[PDB]
Nucleic acid binder design. Structure first.
Ligand code: CA
Length: 71
RNA sequence: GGCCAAAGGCCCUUUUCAGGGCCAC
């Protein structure tokens, strides 16, 4: 993917990532998975990539829903 | 390079496994 430079898009997309990193599922995710994480393994959406608005948001929707494997 | 995931174009919000607005069709 080809990097994004606009802070008005990066700061916002960074925000959405923190929200998912705030959850207890993400904290129970990193604590149990050491970057050998495959796909199918829910993965943080690439902030620097070239995505449309509805496009990146939709990846966050599925990311946040996907994270909820925990207790 | 290319292919898949995501994706109508943009925006706000911790109603956030969520809610909402305009434009378009
Ligand atoms: Ca699709």
């Amino acid at each position: 993917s080809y990097t994004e430079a606009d802070p008005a898009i990066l700061s916002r997309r960074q925000k959405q990532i923190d929200y998912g990193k705030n959850t207890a599922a993400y904290e129970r995710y990193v604590e149990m998975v050491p970057k050998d994480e495959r796909t199918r393994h829910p993965r943080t959406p690439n902030k620097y990539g070239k995505y449309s608005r509805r496009a990146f948001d939709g990846l966050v929707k599925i990311w946040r829903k996907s994270l909820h494997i925990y207790d």
